[PDB]
Amino acid sequence: FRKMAFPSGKVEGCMVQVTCGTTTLNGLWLDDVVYCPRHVICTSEDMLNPNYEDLLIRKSNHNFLVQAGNVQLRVIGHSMQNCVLKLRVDTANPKTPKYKFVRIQPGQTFSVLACYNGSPSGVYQCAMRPNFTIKGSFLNGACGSVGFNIDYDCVSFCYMHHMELPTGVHAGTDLEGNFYGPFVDRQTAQAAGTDTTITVNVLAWLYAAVINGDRWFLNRFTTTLNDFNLVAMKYNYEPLTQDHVDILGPLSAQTGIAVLDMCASLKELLQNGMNGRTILGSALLEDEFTPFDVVRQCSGVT
Amino acid sequence: FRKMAFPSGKVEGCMVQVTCGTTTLNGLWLDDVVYCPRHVICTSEDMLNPNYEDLLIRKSNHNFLVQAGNVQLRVIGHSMQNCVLKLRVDTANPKTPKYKFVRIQPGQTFSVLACYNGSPSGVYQCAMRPNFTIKGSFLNGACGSVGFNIDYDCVSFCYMHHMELPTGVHAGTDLEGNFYGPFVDRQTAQAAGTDTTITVNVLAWLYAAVINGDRWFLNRFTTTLNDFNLVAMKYNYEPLTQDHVDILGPLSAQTGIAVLDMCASLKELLQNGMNGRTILGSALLEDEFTPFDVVRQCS
Numbered sequence: 001f002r003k004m005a006f007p008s009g010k011v012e013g014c015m016v017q018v019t020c021g022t023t024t025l026n027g028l029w030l031d032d033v034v035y036c037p038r039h040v041i042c043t044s045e046d047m048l049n050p051n052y053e054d055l056l057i058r059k060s061n062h063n064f065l066v067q068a069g070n071v072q073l074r075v076i077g078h079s080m081q082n083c084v085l086k087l088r089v090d091t092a093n094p095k096t097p098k099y100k101f102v103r104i105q106p107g108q109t110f111s112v113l114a115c116y117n118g119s120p121s122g123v124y125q126c127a128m129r130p131n132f133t134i135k136g137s138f139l140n141g142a143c144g145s146v147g148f149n150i151d152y153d154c155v156s157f158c159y160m161h162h163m164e165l166p167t168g169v170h171a172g173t174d175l176e177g178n179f180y181g182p183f184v185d186r187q188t189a190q191a192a193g194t195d196t197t198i199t200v201n202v203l204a205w206l207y208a209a210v211i212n213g214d215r216w217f218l219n220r221f222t223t224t225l226n227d228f229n230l231v232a233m234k235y236n237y238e239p240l241t242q243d244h245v246d247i248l249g250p251l252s253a254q255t256g257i258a259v260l261d262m263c264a265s266l267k268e269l270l271q272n273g274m275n276g277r278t279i280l281g282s283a284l285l286e287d288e289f290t291p292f293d294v295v296r297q298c299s300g301v302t
Numbered sequence: 303f304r305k306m307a308f309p310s311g312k313v314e315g316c317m318v319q320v321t322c323g324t325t326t327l328n329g330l331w332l333d334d335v336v337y338c339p340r341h342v343i344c345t346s347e348d349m350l351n352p353n354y355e356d357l358l359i360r361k362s363n364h365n366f367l368v369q370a371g372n373v374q375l376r377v378i379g380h381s382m383q384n385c386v387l388k389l390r391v392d393t394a395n396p397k398t399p400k401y402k403f404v405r406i407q408p409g410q411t412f413s414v415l416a417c418y419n420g421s422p423s424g425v426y427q428c429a430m431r432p433n434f435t436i437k438g439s440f441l442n443g444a445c446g447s448v449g450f451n452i453d454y455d456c457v458s459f460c461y462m463h464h465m466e467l468p469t470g471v472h473a474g475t476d477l478e479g480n481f482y483g484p485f486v487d488r489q490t491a492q493a494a495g496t497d498t499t500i501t502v503n504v505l506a507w508l509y510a511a512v513i514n515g516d517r518w519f520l521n522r523f524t525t526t527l528n529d530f531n532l533v534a535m536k537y538n539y540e541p542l543t544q545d546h547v548d549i550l551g552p553l554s555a556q557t558g559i560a561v562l563d564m565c566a567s568l569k570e571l572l573q574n575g576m577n578g579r580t581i582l583g584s585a586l587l588e589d590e591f592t593p594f595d596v597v598r599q600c601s
């Protein structure tokens with residue numbers, strides 16, 4: 001059982017390089033529009049307190065160099081939507097997949113295609129943390145890298161990368177330029193909220209463990225939502241809602257372990273530790289697999 | 303720090319579906335050849351002691367149904383090279399990337415594109431264990447999925463999937479059809495050797511932790527190579543060779559921590575554990591990042 005990313009080919013054909021002045025980063029080329037972080041128009045002078053509308057009026061179409069591989073794309077228009085810049089180019093991307101822009105919720109997972117100088121370099125699975133950061137792996141130049149899910153042939157883009165917080169976690173926007181979390185695109189003192197653990201995902205992963213033959217943590221007991229949430233709060237876990245319990249319905253039916261039966265196991269795992277054992281080859285309780293992730297990996301959905 | 307796979311697009315355009323009898327698995331379509339596991343030609347009565355030469359001579363081109371998406375590829379000829387079947391088709395794959403076939407050694411990492419019915423389902427990072435198995439994630443029908451690395455725009459194919467061992471780990475071939483390890487494509491009792499931890503990789507990972515600002519596991523001690531190996535074997539770690547020490551030279555220079563000094567830290571980590579702490583997000587010592595992997599992800 002592994003963190004599995006979506007196949008990235010449909011997204012790779014959308015990645016381009018955008019250069020504005022001395023700043024290079026990545027853009028997403030779909031139809032005749034390249035999307036990228038609006039902070040590409042910042043100089044080190046105005047990174048501290050940018051006036052983006054003023055900085056954008058000062059720029060012209062020619063201030064943006066857009067390169068799809070070795071081919072230059074001519075920019076014929078520019079505009080801003082929230083914190084993303086939209087560069088109209090004269091050529092529609094012939095590799096544009098079926099796609100949509102979606103905003104995800106904390107706890108949901110997605111694949112990240114990390115890119116540098118417009119070139120895809122690596123792919124990995126991420127989750128949107130409860131504090132709206134993501135624990136990514138990004139070097140300088142990674143901005144404009146995107147996160148996505150694939151459903152049938154349709155790519156749902158949910159994340160565009162903007163910045164790294166002092167603690168090393170990452171912050172970005174959806175593809176309409178709306179930030180995830182209480183963050184702003186300016187170089188200033190910013191810190192994530194105290195993070196919490198994604199309870200429903202931990203449960204999903206315990207079900208994955210059971211499905212894969214790791215059963216030592218199961219017990220005879222059950223609990224109540226009310227009782228478990230008092231433990232969840234104590235251990236900095238997200239509260240468990242009736243909606244979560246229902247989403248775990250399928251896994252409860254396949255394994256014959258009811259969610260509040262699995263909560264009793266989880267409660268004991270939190271209250272007494274793991275007694276030097278492991279679960280799915282992990283010494284920690286993993287919280288970046290959704291219920292859907294568990295089913296898809298134990299069902300082989302293409 | 304993440305287990306990062308290579309972008310899979312170049313491999314995706316090569317995956318096809320191969321059917322023989324009642325068996326369908328995946329094939330790898332490069333130029334005008336489709337590579338797949340030869341056990342596609344087995345029936346239910348053939349799985350214990352198949353005579354592949356005898357099964358193959360009885361096959362005609364039209365017994366192989368190859369589909370690339372909704373397009374059916376016409377099989378022009380077939381031959382067997384070790385444990386892979388090479389199906390000649392009348393159409394070269396126009397999406398054929400720059401590629402090569404490489405055989406890897408234990409400790410090496412690669413990306414796996416897990417596929418079913420010729421459709422890619424997911425991508426993940428894997429390593430060749432010292433006992434020549436891989437700890438993959440494969441369901442029924444995953445045979446023919448390949449493992450690969452990409453350097454510049456060249457795909458090096460290094461693994462094709464054939465079977466699951468009773469312990470749940472996985473066995474397969476290089477793209478010339480030679481199995482990794484003592485395994486054979488028979489459903490006979492086969493035993494994965496005792497596995498060990500890939501020491502040189504754990505060290506590389508500890509260097510990565512130092513690069514990203516963790517020094518809490520260092521200590522004032524050094525060790526001889528021999529003394530390190532005597533201790534580490536007691537934890538079922540692979541022997542560290544002088545080759546391994548040389549390989550770690552660049553990471554040693556960048557961090558200023560001599561290889562044998564990092565070996566001293568590892569000895570202490572094995573002795574103490576982490577005492578409630580984590581290293582690069584893990585509560586265990588990670589051994590599926592190589593020295594090259596660390597360099598690529600940190601710079």
Ligand SMILES: *C(=O)[C@H](C[C@@H]1CCNC1=O)NC(=O)[C@H](CC1CCCCC1)NC(=O)c1cc2ccccc2[nH]1
Binds near residue numbers: 165
């Ligand atoms: C874009 O390519 C990079 C991606 C960063 C770089 C390192 N790791 C990443 O994920 N983005 C940045 O460098 C931003 C640029 C700013 C421009 C003005 C608007 C805000 C973003 N800067 C930072 O991410 C950043 C982090 C940080 C931590 C401590 C002190 C300063 C600091 N700046």
Ligand SMILES: *C(=O)[C@H](C[C@@H]1CCNC1=O)NC(=O)[C@H](CC1CCCCC1)NC(=O)c1cc2ccccc2[nH]1
Binds near residue numbers: 348441446464467487
């Ligand atoms: C190909 O798609 C599958 C991949 C398996 C299926 C489950 N998980 C995987 O990785 N390959 C097989 O099923 C092989 C087929 C045999 C045909 C004859 C030659 C040898 C391979 N069989 C097995 O993987 C397998 C494992 C196993 C363990 C214990 C009893 C029987 C058994 N069969």
